Enzyme design. Structure first.
Site, PDB file in Angstrom:
ATOM      1  N   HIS C 200       0.823  -1.230   0.000  1.00  0.00           N
ATOM      2  CA  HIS C 200       0.000   0.000   0.000  1.00  0.00           C
ATOM      3  C   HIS C 200       0.846   1.266   0.000  1.00  0.00           C
ATOM      4  N   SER C 204      -1.034  -1.290  -6.437  1.00  0.00           N
ATOM      5  CA  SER C 204      -0.859  -2.485  -7.236  1.00  0.00           C
ATOM      6  C   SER C 204      -0.233  -2.274  -8.616  1.00  0.00           C
ATOM      7  N   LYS C 226     -15.501  -8.672  -6.996  1.00  0.00           N
ATOM      8  CA  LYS C 226     -14.662  -9.679  -7.665  1.00  0.00           C
ATOM      9  C   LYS C 226     -14.069 -10.662  -6.682  1.00  0.00           C
ATOM     10  N   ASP C 227     -13.615 -10.138  -5.551  1.00  0.00           N
ATOM     11  CA  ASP C 227     -13.024 -10.972  -4.516  1.00  0.00           C
ATOM     12  C   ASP C 227     -14.021 -11.957  -3.910  1.00  0.00           C
ATOM     13  N   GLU C 270       4.445 -34.270   0.604  1.00  0.00           N
ATOM     14  CA  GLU C 270       3.185 -33.914  -0.056  1.00  0.00           C
ATOM     15  C   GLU C 270       3.447 -33.168  -1.394  1.00  0.00           C
TER      16      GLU C 270
HETATM   17  C1  HEM Z   1       0.348 -16.202   3.036  1.00  0.00           C
HETATM   18  C2  HEM Z   1       0.898 -15.790   1.905  1.00  0.00           C
HETATM   19  C3  HEM Z   1       0.531 -14.528   1.236  1.00  0.00           C
HETATM   20  C4  HEM Z   1      -0.531 -13.683   1.427  1.00  0.00           C
HETATM   21  C5  HEM Z   1      -1.676 -13.782   2.423  1.00  0.00           C
HETATM   22  C6  HEM Z   1      -0.354 -12.639   0.470  1.00  0.00           C
HETATM   23  C7  HEM Z   1      -1.261 -11.585   0.364  1.00  0.00           C
HETATM   24  C8  HEM Z   1      -1.246 -10.687  -0.678  1.00  0.00           C
HETATM   25  C9  HEM Z   1      -2.323  -9.850  -1.031  1.00  0.00           C
HETATM   26  C10 HEM Z   1      -3.668  -9.810  -0.335  1.00  0.00           C
HETATM   27  C11 HEM Z   1      -1.918  -9.106  -2.097  1.00  0.00           C
HETATM   28  C12 HEM Z   1      -2.735  -8.074  -2.836  1.00  0.00           C
HETATM   29  C13 HEM Z   1      -3.671  -8.749  -3.846  1.00  0.00           C
HETATM   30  C14 HEM Z   1      -2.923  -9.395  -4.980  1.00  0.00           C
HETATM   31  O1  HEM Z   1      -2.377  -8.706  -5.867  1.00  0.00           O
HETATM   32  O2  HEM Z   1      -2.865 -10.638  -5.036  1.00  0.00           O
HETATM   33  C15 HEM Z   1      -0.589  -9.480  -2.400  1.00  0.00           C
HETATM   34  C16 HEM Z   1       0.168  -8.916  -3.411  1.00  0.00           C
HETATM   35  C17 HEM Z   1       1.467  -9.342  -3.689  1.00  0.00           C
HETATM   36  N1  HEM Z   1       2.118 -10.397  -3.128  1.00  0.00           N
HETATM   37 FE1  HEM Z   1       1.442 -11.549  -1.798  1.00  0.00          FE
HETATM   38  N2  HEM Z   1       0.748 -12.819  -0.271  1.00  0.00           N
HETATM   39  C18 HEM Z   1       1.337 -13.945   0.135  1.00  0.00           C
HETATM   40  C19 HEM Z   1       2.500 -14.549  -0.350  1.00  0.00           C
HETATM   41  C20 HEM Z   1       3.335 -13.981  -1.309  1.00  0.00           C
HETATM   42  C21 HEM Z   1       4.479 -14.589  -1.872  1.00  0.00           C
HETATM   43  C22 HEM Z   1       4.986 -15.974  -1.517  1.00  0.00           C
HETATM   44  C23 HEM Z   1       5.013 -13.664  -2.779  1.00  0.00           C
HETATM   45  C24 HEM Z   1       6.218 -13.774  -3.646  1.00  0.00           C
HETATM   46  C25 HEM Z   1       7.204 -14.662  -3.510  1.00  0.00           C
HETATM   47  C26 HEM Z   1       4.162 -12.514  -2.745  1.00  0.00           C
HETATM   48  C27 HEM Z   1       4.352 -11.370  -3.477  1.00  0.00           C
HETATM   49  C28 HEM Z   1       3.333 -10.446  -3.711  1.00  0.00           C
HETATM   50  C29 HEM Z   1       3.480  -9.355  -4.699  1.00  0.00           C
HETATM   51  C30 HEM Z   1       4.691  -9.064  -5.555  1.00  0.00           C
HETATM   52  C31 HEM Z   1       2.323  -8.669  -4.696  1.00  0.00           C
HETATM   53  C32 HEM Z   1       2.015  -7.461  -5.553  1.00  0.00           C
HETATM   54  C33 HEM Z   1       1.163  -7.848  -6.762  1.00  0.00           C
HETATM   55  C34 HEM Z   1       0.821  -6.706  -7.698  1.00  0.00           C
HETATM   56  O3  HEM Z   1       0.600  -5.536  -7.304  1.00  0.00           O
HETATM   57  O4  HEM Z   1       0.744  -6.934  -8.923  1.00  0.00           O
HETATM   58  N3  HEM Z   1       3.148 -12.744  -1.859  1.00  0.00           N
HETATM   59  N4  HEM Z   1      -0.191 -10.461  -1.515  1.00  0.00           N
HETATM   60  C1  HEM Z   2      -0.813 -22.040   7.016  1.00  0.00           C
HETATM   61  C2  HEM Z   2      -1.625 -22.610   7.911  1.00  0.00           C
HETATM   62  C3  HEM Z   2      -1.710 -24.079   8.131  1.00  0.00           C
HETATM   63  C4  HEM Z   2      -1.349 -25.078   7.271  1.00  0.00           C
HETATM   64  C5  HEM Z   2      -0.762 -24.933   5.881  1.00  0.00           C
HETATM   65  C6  HEM Z   2      -1.624 -26.308   7.942  1.00  0.00           C
HETATM   66  C7  HEM Z   2      -1.342 -27.541   7.343  1.00  0.00           C
HETATM   67  C8  HEM Z   2      -1.646 -28.754   7.917  1.00  0.00           C
HETATM   68  C9  HEM Z   2      -1.520 -30.008   7.280  1.00  0.00           C
HETATM   69  C10 HEM Z   2      -1.023 -30.261   5.871  1.00  0.00           C
HETATM   70  C11 HEM Z   2      -1.924 -30.942   8.180  1.00  0.00           C
HETATM   71  C12 HEM Z   2      -1.993 -32.429   7.960  1.00  0.00           C
HETATM   72  C13 HEM Z   2      -3.420 -32.678   7.478  1.00  0.00           C
HETATM   73  C14 HEM Z   2      -3.672 -34.143   7.382  1.00  0.00           C
HETATM   74  O1  HEM Z   2      -3.038 -34.846   6.556  1.00  0.00           O
HETATM   75  O2  HEM Z   2      -4.536 -34.639   8.128  1.00  0.00           O
HETATM   76  C15 HEM Z   2      -2.304 -30.269   9.359  1.00  0.00           C
HETATM   77  C16 HEM Z   2      -2.775 -30.900  10.484  1.00  0.00           C
HETATM   78  C17 HEM Z   2      -3.178 -30.222  11.626  1.00  0.00           C
HETATM   79  N1  HEM Z   2      -3.196 -28.889  11.800  1.00  0.00           N
HETATM   80 FE1  HEM Z   2      -2.691 -27.590  10.526  1.00  0.00          FE
HETATM   81  N2  HEM Z   2      -2.138 -26.092   9.161  1.00  0.00           N
HETATM   82  C18 HEM Z   2      -2.227 -24.770   9.355  1.00  0.00           C
HETATM   83  C19 HEM Z   2      -2.711 -24.090  10.478  1.00  0.00           C
HETATM   84  C20 HEM Z   2      -3.132 -24.702  11.654  1.00  0.00           C
HETATM   85  C21 HEM Z   2      -3.524 -24.053  12.855  1.00  0.00           C
HETATM   86  C22 HEM Z   2      -3.589 -22.550  13.083  1.00  0.00           C
HETATM   87  C23 HEM Z   2      -3.837 -25.063  13.775  1.00  0.00           C
HETATM   88  C24 HEM Z   2      -4.311 -24.995  15.183  1.00  0.00           C
HETATM   89  C25 HEM Z   2      -4.548 -23.873  15.837  1.00  0.00           C
HETATM   90  C26 HEM Z   2      -3.627 -26.294  13.104  1.00  0.00           C
HETATM   91  C27 HEM Z   2      -3.834 -27.497  13.708  1.00  0.00           C
HETATM   92  C28 HEM Z   2      -3.648 -28.703  13.054  1.00  0.00           C
HETATM   93  C29 HEM Z   2      -3.941 -29.979  13.736  1.00  0.00           C
HETATM   94  C30 HEM Z   2      -4.459 -30.194  15.142  1.00  0.00           C
HETATM   95  C31 HEM Z   2      -3.651 -30.931  12.843  1.00  0.00           C
HETATM   96  C32 HEM Z   2      -3.802 -32.416  13.077  1.00  0.00           C
HETATM   97  C33 HEM Z   2      -5.206 -32.842  12.623  1.00  0.00           C
HETATM   98  C34 HEM Z   2      -5.203 -33.261  11.163  1.00  0.00           C
HETATM   99  O3  HEM Z   2      -4.365 -34.107  10.760  1.00  0.00           O
HETATM  100  O4  HEM Z   2      -6.029 -32.778  10.346  1.00  0.00           O
HETATM  101  N3  HEM Z   2      -3.163 -26.052  11.841  1.00  0.00           N
HETATM  102  N4  HEM Z   2      -2.108 -28.925   9.189  1.00  0.00           N
HETATM  103  C1  JAG Z   3      -5.837  -5.377   0.967  1.00  0.00           C
HETATM  104  C2  JAG Z   3      -5.937  -5.629  -0.518  1.00  0.00           C
HETATM  105  N1  JAG Z   3      -5.230  -4.802  -1.310  1.00  0.00           N
HETATM  106  C3  JAG Z   3      -5.204  -4.874  -2.661  1.00  0.00           C
HETATM  107  C4  JAG Z   3      -5.984  -5.925  -3.395  1.00  0.00           C
HETATM  108  C5  JAG Z   3      -5.935  -5.981  -4.914  1.00  0.00           C
HETATM  109  C6  JAG Z   3      -5.850  -4.576  -5.530  1.00  0.00           C
HETATM  110  C7  JAG Z   3      -5.006  -3.502  -4.811  1.00  0.00           C
HETATM  111  C8  JAG Z   3      -4.368  -3.880  -3.460  1.00  0.00           C
HETATM  112  C9  JAG Z   3      -6.797  -6.892  -2.596  1.00  0.00           C
HETATM  113  O1  JAG Z   3      -7.476  -7.788  -3.156  1.00  0.00           O
HETATM  114  C10 JAG Z   3      -6.781  -6.736  -1.105  1.00  0.00           C
HETATM  115  C11 JAG Z   3      -7.552  -7.667  -0.225  1.00  0.00           C
HETATM  116  C12 JAG Z   3      -6.822  -8.530   0.594  1.00  0.00           C
HETATM  117  C13 JAG Z   3      -7.474  -9.421   1.432  1.00  0.00           C
HETATM  118  C14 JAG Z   3      -8.879  -9.492   1.497  1.00  0.00           C
HETATM  119  O2  JAG Z   3      -9.472 -10.395   2.387  1.00  0.00           O
HETATM  120  C15 JAG Z   3      -8.747 -10.689   3.530  1.00  0.00           C
HETATM  121  C16 JAG Z   3      -8.280 -11.986   3.797  1.00  0.00           C
HETATM  122  C17 JAG Z   3      -7.509 -12.223   4.943  1.00  0.00           C
HETATM  123  C18 JAG Z   3      -7.199 -11.173   5.816  1.00  0.00           C
HETATM  124  O3  JAG Z   3      -6.422 -11.397   6.922  1.00  0.00           O
HETATM  125  C19 JAG Z   3      -4.990 -11.260   6.806  1.00  0.00           C
HETATM  126  F1  JAG Z   3      -4.572 -10.196   7.473  1.00  0.00           F
HETATM  127  F2  JAG Z   3      -4.604 -11.137   5.538  1.00  0.00           F
HETATM  128  F3  JAG Z   3      -4.422 -12.332   7.321  1.00  0.00           F
HETATM  129  C20 JAG Z   3      -7.647  -9.879   5.548  1.00  0.00           C
HETATM  130  C21 JAG Z   3      -8.419  -9.644   4.413  1.00  0.00           C
HETATM  131  C22 JAG Z   3      -9.617  -8.617   0.671  1.00  0.00           C
HETATM  132  C23 JAG Z   3      -8.955  -7.714  -0.190  1.00  0.00           C
END
Ligand code: HEM
Ligand code: HEM
Ligand code: JAG
Ligand code: CDL
Ligand code: CDL
Ligand code: PEE
Ligand code: PEE
Ligand code: HEC
Ligand code: HEC
Ligand code: HEM
Ligand code: HEM
Ligand code: JAG
Ligand code: FES
Lengths: 239, 147, 378, 378, 239
Positions: C200, C204, C226-227, C270
């Site tokens: 921000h 974008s 859209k979202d 996985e």
């Molecule tokens: C939990 C993982 C992530 C979350 C929640 C997240 C969230 C977001 C959100 C909400 C936006 C704005 C909407 C969009 O353009 O898609 C954004 C933009 C962006 N994210 Fe992520 N992101 C994540 C991981 C990543 C990763 C792994 C990368 C790169 C390695 C990345 C790079 C970017 C970039 C470059 C933008 C700008 C896009 C643009 O303006 O064209 N993000 N991210």
């Molecule tokens: C990025 C966020 C997270 C990812 C990617 C993730 C991913 C996973 C995956 C791949 C498994 C194995 C699923 C299966 O084969 O059964 C798993 C299991 C589990 N996750 Fe998560 N997890 C996330 C967040 C959380 C959070 C916030 C909690 C608890 C507060 C949680 C609690 C558990 C528990 C209790 C299991 C064992 C039950 C099961 O196997 O389904 N996870 N998680």
């Molecule tokens: C905050 C955001 N900014 C922008 C774009 C595209 C266009 C321009 C920049 C988005 O789509 C945008 C957005 C991002 C997330 C949205 O839903 C949420 C999903 C999760 C959320 O929690 C948190 F914090 F990300 F973990 C907070 C919001 C809704 C909208």
């Protein structure tokens, strides 16, 4: 170490919205009971699990009462044996895995609770295994007790063909052929591994329909709001 | 201060006293006769210690080094020539090999088709490494600590 | 004046959510950010509800997960939502990164690098998550992958046993993996907020890679609507897996409990790690393989420095477009190869694919940029 | 220009931490905010490290906590830091609230009300924390306190069994209490940040209750150095407990495992709930007692509305000062009475103290304010 | 239901910086071993715990080898009994609580691992209990088996006086009087409940000293920075 993967049999629950044949489950349970339960454990299925699926409450109570189980201690401090109830799980044949190996010449019979989910092919695999036992090809023999099955990995198993024609009389009087006995037990083992099956698919239908409704509606809402911009024309008017 | 606090918290994550308790196992060498194998429970695994005869020593000494799937000589697999200590887990897909049997007269597996010699080396079968040589040291001539 | 711009809490919401100036022309590839957020929140809720029923003790662990699926009310739908939700997360992640690469959004350096960190955190989370059921693939996957760190000279062997809290992946490892797996998503949420905080600053990027200040539209209603549509489609994909094929993206061997003796046939992580797992197996030397697996992810941090083209987006760049789609197809090949046994022809294909991965990023796509420039007299 | 005011992350740090304009004259009672932060972070770290070794299964739970103290390296010092750290938290909380009351900081309505929420969240956290060891007082405390909600007409009885996930405090209750207890501190951290976000709208109150804009000093170094000194004194108090009397603020009966038959002699919550526990026991009717226990905390939200004095602080207000110190002494009496068996004279003292609590807040201190005003011709 | 609380005995570990008398622990262990261990369990103390505290590695190995313990299964699938080692915990007298009640007429003997920490008064309490057994006052008697102790709540206990003069010969040859036997066993039960005691107090001393150093230093740093403001004078100079 060549490999023959199972064919895809047309199960009554094969399709996306197709439920399990519960009468097939009822038969299949008895195939576990009469045949398997002296070799394989099935630790995650209890006698209560059967109620509203293949048996009534009263039928499942009778099936539970039929078996031994340890319980205790009593006030004296001793561990007694009692008639089972709904809260009891299906009892293990042996007290432990090491005892199980001894009874089956080294090989450990796997627990069957999840065997459909724990083997590639599922019910297609197990059905092929149970019906697929045949005479070995020339150039071949294993240790005295390890049988030939073409569907088992490495082509040699440690299980005696367990199913054959009329190994059990079924409660509903279905002709107990080898292939009927295998079909039924697979259908039960499917339900064992995945009780949720029928509910899961009920939810699937209701999801598909709601998405059928909501997606084009939300898409229409999208195009509606965006229509201000899609329509717009620009004009450049320098002096 | 911060050194101490951090260093303690780091210590937290390392093995607790009860995990260190199961780290090692003491074996009495006079309790295993010449030729026979004796199994043990070690880190939730079988552990084979084998008293080897004058014949088993010489017969595993002049084996072909190249022909083996996993090329190791015998005098570098063990610390004393008359004792071979091994984990009793079959390296391919995890079984417990049975002593004094097989083609190569050592350990044999009725799971897939593996044959180990008297030195614990894979000779004829699907296994990729030999039976695992643990870390150990002889203390007094009568005792061995594995771990 | 309104109480959307005035109130200290609403002010942040109004500026980062409602009145946010967004480019008019952003495509479907911009939805993945929002979807990543939904994924994260979805995992946290489902996860928390699972944690109300799970236990990290090695004896009860497998049983608790199955107890969830059989005795806990709708525990099954929660459990499989969480497992397929993890897949949906990684689908969303790679699509989101791909967008960044293709349209050159990585020029937003801070946003991009925070991204790399987020990626690595979600990876760490999902690796430790898959261990929690304590099945075969769980236990054996964790064992092989962790034990790669022993390849580090001097310290490596200690390091591995310190992560484990013992001499194998056992009681102390599972318990701590539960604790780290619980806390990390919350750390992700924080870093994700910093991620947007930097986004921000600039606003974008868009598909043209040309500045969009001349034609911004307010985020509401255009992208709120859209979202919502995107979210709806994400839920469809998720629930299609959960209700029609919940086992499709997992492995069967994780339905038999963990056995420290009995090794599974072809041990593998996985699906979303398979590409990097293949890269590891390409190099014959173990420490080399580890440093390649590590560099297969970290190279993302290097992408911005490798940028050569005078145009930002690949929209107007045919050569780069092809090389990009080659890089995608190569990654699909590495995923396939990662899933295979170590034999002919999968060794050679794997080697050749891993060569092409690093070749595409470090040599070919930079060269292609400069060729494109000289074709435009630039 | 500098990169403390420029960089998006440093900007927030520079404004809320370094160049923050703070009143010149703020006393020791302003240290408690910083100390609450330290407490929270201390609990999170120690807590996370404990969670690497604990299990929420009813059979293994008590054993795991003791296994921490005996076999886990420095697990004891971590465990008792966490238990006494919870006490240190509540000491800090009541001191922090007392400051607010005495100096009238509660006029900062949003800051204050977020405070109330924070208080209630820390309470919920610490209640569920004390259950986790699964000792007698843990189990029996949880049973009595939870089961108070059954006093609600129509729904109450269902509600209680739904929290429990069964018909008593058992397997499902302990597991979920572990999950909620893990997540809540993180929710606290978020709400605490919103707490400060509103505080930095107005800046700090001071001991005079007169505006300090005419004499602000930068936070660094003046209050960075004071806060360090405060932190040091907090660590001393904590470690004096941990290393010299770790059992002093707990109860012995929580060293015998939880027994659903064998009831402890005088079942009671941990010391920081005792005041409100005494209020509960004052009212003879059960639902009345619950609504009084609830209103004994929620009345904090009502304090700002009850403010009558034309002066903000109690500094220049003798009558209010006495009534305030009476209210403190009364709370000390309620804590003592809360710890006692239900008998003469502790019933009557308890009744009389509970009357005086609500009397002081709702009648006497408001009257005293207006009397003070009319003494100043106001 | 009147109450007599214990007096505060001058223990060798009473003070803030005073360690446990480890030779007293060594004796006290033997008082658990010879007297208690046929009635009370002590589940959280293992034979390894003794090493570097009251016994050597080699001594503790001998003490461990002396006792029976179940282990298994072996490859046959049976549960055998074996000589103990350092990794084994102190063995429970009975297989369960219900068995324990039967052996002691309804009353369950509490586990002693934490009994110092689990009872108000601690070692002062237990010492008073063990030495305080006396003849009942007039107007009093309990059920045949429930003895009179003035320190137990409700004035009547379900434990036979367990200590008396020369109930054991000590390994170091200390005259085993009733009060010496109680003193030693309390010192052991203190260590049982709180092994950390000695380390805890070592850390306490080092904390007190560092705080003795850092507090006035940080306080000096405070006054130093603040001295710009403490010194300052103001002047109001209107035109
Ligand atoms: C939990 C993982 C992530 C979350 C929640 C997240 C969230 C977001 C959100 C909400 C936006 C704005 C909407 C969009 O353009 O898609 C954004 C933009 C962006 N994210 Fe992520 N992101 C994540 C991981 C990543 C990763 C792994 C990368 C790169 C390695 C990345 C790079 C970017 C970039 C470059 C933008 C700008 C896009 C643009 O303006 O064209 N993000 N991210
Ligand atoms: C990025 C966020 C997270 C990812 C990617 C993730 C991913 C996973 C995956 C791949 C498994 C194995 C699923 C299966 O084969 O059964 C798993 C299991 C589990 N996750 Fe998560 N997890 C996330 C967040 C959380 C959070 C916030 C909690 C608890 C507060 C949680 C609690 C558990 C528990 C209790 C299991 C064992 C039950 C099961 O196997 O389904 N996870 N998680
Ligand atoms: C905050 C955001 N900014 C922008 C774009 C595209 C266009 C321009 C920049 C988005 O789509 C945008 C957005 C991002 C997330 C949205 O839903 C949420 C999903 C999760 C959320 O929690 C948190 F914090 F990300 F973990 C907070 C919001 C809704 C909208
Ligand atoms: C003149 C006299 C000279 C001799 C004096 C030596 C002084 C050394 C300085 C010092 O005191 O710092 C130790 C200090 C804290 O260690 P500590 O005092 O033992 O901590 C208390 C507990 O034991 C907690 O410690 P811990 O158990 O968490 O950490 C150790 C443990 C961690 O890992 C495992 O648990 C396994 O590793 C071990 O098992 C021990 C082997 C060490 C492995 C190092 C690999 C070398 C290659 O650590 C450091 O600041 C780094 C220096 C490390 C010492 C040098 C050796 C390693 C070189 C690394 C570069
Ligand atoms: C639970 C944890 C709670 C943490 C509380 C945080 C306290 C804090 O950071 O504020 C500084 C707060 C204010 O003291 P200050 O900065 O000297 O201000 C004095 C006023 O200007 C008023 O100045 P004054 O002219 O009225 O003189 C008062 C004089 C005390 O007068 C005497 O000479 C006696 O100074 C003190 O109050 C310090 C007492 C420490 C005496 C120890 C000897 C060194 O310091 C304390 O409350 C005592 C901490 C000092 C520890 C010294 C250990 C040696
Ligand atoms: C994997 C499956 C990929 C599905 C792609 C669908 C095919 C359609 C398509 O995307 O190609 C067209 C093409 C034309 O785009 P423009 O030049 O901007 O538009 C010109 C005017 N219309 O659209 C795109 O390039 C799409 C944007 C690229 C998205 C990246 C794809 C994401 C999946 C790959 C993962 C990459 C991860 C790298 C990890 C390390
Ligand atoms: C409980 C123990 C309380 C310890 C108090 C130490 C005694 C010293 C003291 O505080 O009294 C003096 C008095 C004089 O202050 P001023 O009028 O601002 O200064 C005039 C010029 N010097 O100082 C104060 O009033 C201290 C500020 C009040 C802090 C509140 C005390 C906190 C503990 C009580 C908890 C209240 C919680 C309510 C929960 C519901
Ligand atoms: C008297 C012994 C015995 C009987 C009867 C028996 N089994 Fe088994 N079963 C075994 C043993 C032993 C193995 C392990 C084989 C191996 O590892 O080579 C086994 C393995 C299996 C496997 C695993 C195959 C695989 O892919 O690894 C399935 C599925 C199975 N049995 C199902 C059944 C069913 C269905 C029945 C009857 C309706 C049955 N068994 C009856 C002893 C028996
Ligand atoms: C043959 C039986 C027996 C012997 C010998 C015995 N105990 Fe006990 N002990 C009991 C029983 C039974 C109780 C429970 C008493 C009750 O609840 O009334 C008990 C209770 C206790 C209590 C709990 C008191 C309380 O506050 O509730 C302590 C402490 C104790 N014993 C310590 C010892 C010590 C120390 C020794 C020997 C050095 C010892 N015991 C020997 C049977 C025995
Ligand atoms: C986890 C709990 C809490 C944390 C971390 C916290 C944090 C803080 C911090 C850091 C400050 C600024 C420094 C200070 O003046 O102390 C502050 C101020 C304040 N807090 Fe809290 N607080 C918490 C709970 C509460 C509660 C329970 C209340 C009231 C019921 C409250 C009301 C206030 C008020 C009114 C101020 C302004 C003080 C002034 O300017 O004079 N806080 N808080
Ligand atoms: C406001 C923050 C917190 C408070 C007030 C708090 C309070 C408590 C209390 C009072 C106990 C019982 C201590 C005892 O008697 O032994 C406890 C136990 C525990 N807490 Fe916390 N806690 C907090 C944060 C956390 C966090 C963030 C975690 C984990 C991530 C955690 C994990 C635990 C565990 C595992 C136990 C059981 C071990 C033990 O009994 O010490 N806590 N907590
Ligand atoms: C942010 C702060 N503001 C103010 C005052 C008094 C004077 C004016 C306002 C403070 O003492 C103050 C402060 C608050 C907390 C401090 O340490 C922290 C402790 C915890 C922490 O994490 C979090 F977010 F609170 F959870 C963040 C910081 C250090 C300083
Ligand atoms: S499993 Fe024994 S060698 Fe393949």
């Amino acid at each position: 170490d060549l490999e023959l993967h199972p064919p895809s049999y047309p199960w009554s629950h094969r399709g996306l919205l197709s439920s399990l044949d519960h009468t097939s489950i009822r038969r299949g349970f008895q195939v576990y009971k009469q045949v398997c339960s002296s070799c394989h454990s099935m630790d995650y299925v209890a006698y209560r699990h059967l109620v509203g699926v293949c048996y009534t409450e009263d039928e499942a109570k009778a099936l539970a009462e039929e078996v031994e189980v340890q319980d205790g201690p009593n006030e004296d401090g001793e561990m007694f044996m009692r008639p089972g109830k709904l809260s009891d799980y299906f009892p293990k044949p042996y007290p432990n895995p090491e005892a199980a190996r001894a009874a089956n010449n080294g090989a450990l019979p796997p627990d069957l609770s999840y065997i459909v989910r724990a083997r590639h092919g599922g019910e297609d695999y197990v059905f092929s295994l149970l019906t697929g036992y045949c005479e070995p090809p020339t150039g071949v023999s294993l240790r005295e007790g390890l049988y030939f099955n073409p569907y088992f990995p490495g082509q040699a198993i440690g299980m005696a063909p367990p199913i054959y024609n009329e190994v059990l009389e079924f409660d509903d009087g279905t002709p107990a052929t080898m292939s009927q006995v295998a079909k039924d037990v697979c259908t039960f083992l499917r339900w064992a591994a995945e009780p949720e099956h029928d509910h899961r698919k009920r939810m699937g239908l209701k999801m598909l329909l709601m998405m059928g409704l909501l997606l084009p509606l939300v898409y229409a809402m999208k195009r509606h709001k965006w229509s201000v911009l899609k329509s717009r024309k620009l004009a450049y008017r320098p002096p | 201060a911060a050194k101490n606090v951090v260093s303690q918290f780091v210590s937290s994550m390392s093995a607790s006293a009860d995990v260190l308790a199961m780290s090692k196992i003491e074996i009495k060498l006079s309790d295993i006769p010449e030729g026979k194998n004796m199994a043990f429970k070690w880190r939730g695994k079988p552990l084979f210690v084998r008293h080897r005869t004058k014949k088993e020593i010489d017969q595993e000494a002049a084996v072909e080094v190249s022909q083996l799937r996993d090329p190791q000589h015998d005098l570098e697999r063990v610390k004393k020539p008359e004792w071979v200590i091994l984990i009793g887990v079959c390296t391919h897909l995890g079984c417990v090999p049975i002593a004094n049997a097989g083609d190569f007269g050592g350990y044999y597996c009725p799971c897939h088709g593996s044959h180990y010699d008297a030195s614990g080396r894979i000779r004829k079968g699907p296994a990729p490494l030999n039976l695992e040589v643990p870390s150990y040291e002889f203390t007094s001539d009568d005792m061995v600590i594995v771990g | 004046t309104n109480i959307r711009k005035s109130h200290p809490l609403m002010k942040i919401v109004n500026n980062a959510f409602i009145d946010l100036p967004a480019p008019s022309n952003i495509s479907s590839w911009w939805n993945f950010g929002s979807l990543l957020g939904i994924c994260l929140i979805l995992q946290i809720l489902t996860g928390l509800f699972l944690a109300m029923h799970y236990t990290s003790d090695t004896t009860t662990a497998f049983s608790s997960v199955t107890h969830i699926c059989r005795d806990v009310n709708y525990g099954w739908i929660i459990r499989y939502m969480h497992a397929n939700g993890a897949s949906m997360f990684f689908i969303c992640l790679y699509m989101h990164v791909g967008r960044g690469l293709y349209y050159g959004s990585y020029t937003f350096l801070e946003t991009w690098n925070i991204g790399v960190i987020l990626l690595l955190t979600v990876m760490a989370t999902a690796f430790m998550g898959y261990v929690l059921p304590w099945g075969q693939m769980s236990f054996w996957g964790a064992t092989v992958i962790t034990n790669l760190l022993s390849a580090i000279p001097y310290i490596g062997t200690n390091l591995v046993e310190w992560i484990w809290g013992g001499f194998s992946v056992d009681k102390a490892t599972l318990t701590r993996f539960f604790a780290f797996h619980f806390i990390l998503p919350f750390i992700i949420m924080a870093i994700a907020m910093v991620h947007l905080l930097f986004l921000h600053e600039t606003g974008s990027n868009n598909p043209t890679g040309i500045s969009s200040d001349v034609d911004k539209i307010p985020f509401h209603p255009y992208y709120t609507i859209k979202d919502i549509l995107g979210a709806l489609l994400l839920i469809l994909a998720l629930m299609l897996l959960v209700l029609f094929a919940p086992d499709l993206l997992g492995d069967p061997d994780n339905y038999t409990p963990a056995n420290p003796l009995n090794t599974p046939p072809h041990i593998k992580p996985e699906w979303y790690f398979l590409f990097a797992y293949a890269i590891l197996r390409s190099i014959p030397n173990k420490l080399g393989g580890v440093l390649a697996l590590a560099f297969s992810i970290l190279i993302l941090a290097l992408i911005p420095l490798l940028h050569t083209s005078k145009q930002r987006s690949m929209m107007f760049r045919p050569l780069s477009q092809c090389l990009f789609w080659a890089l995608v197809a190569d990654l699909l090949t590495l995923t396939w190869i990662g899933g295979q046994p170590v034999e002919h022809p999968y060794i050679t294909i794997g080697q050749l694919a891993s060569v092409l991965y690093f070749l595409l990023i470090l040599v070919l796509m930079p060269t292609a940029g400069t060729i494109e420039n000289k074709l435009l007299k630039w």
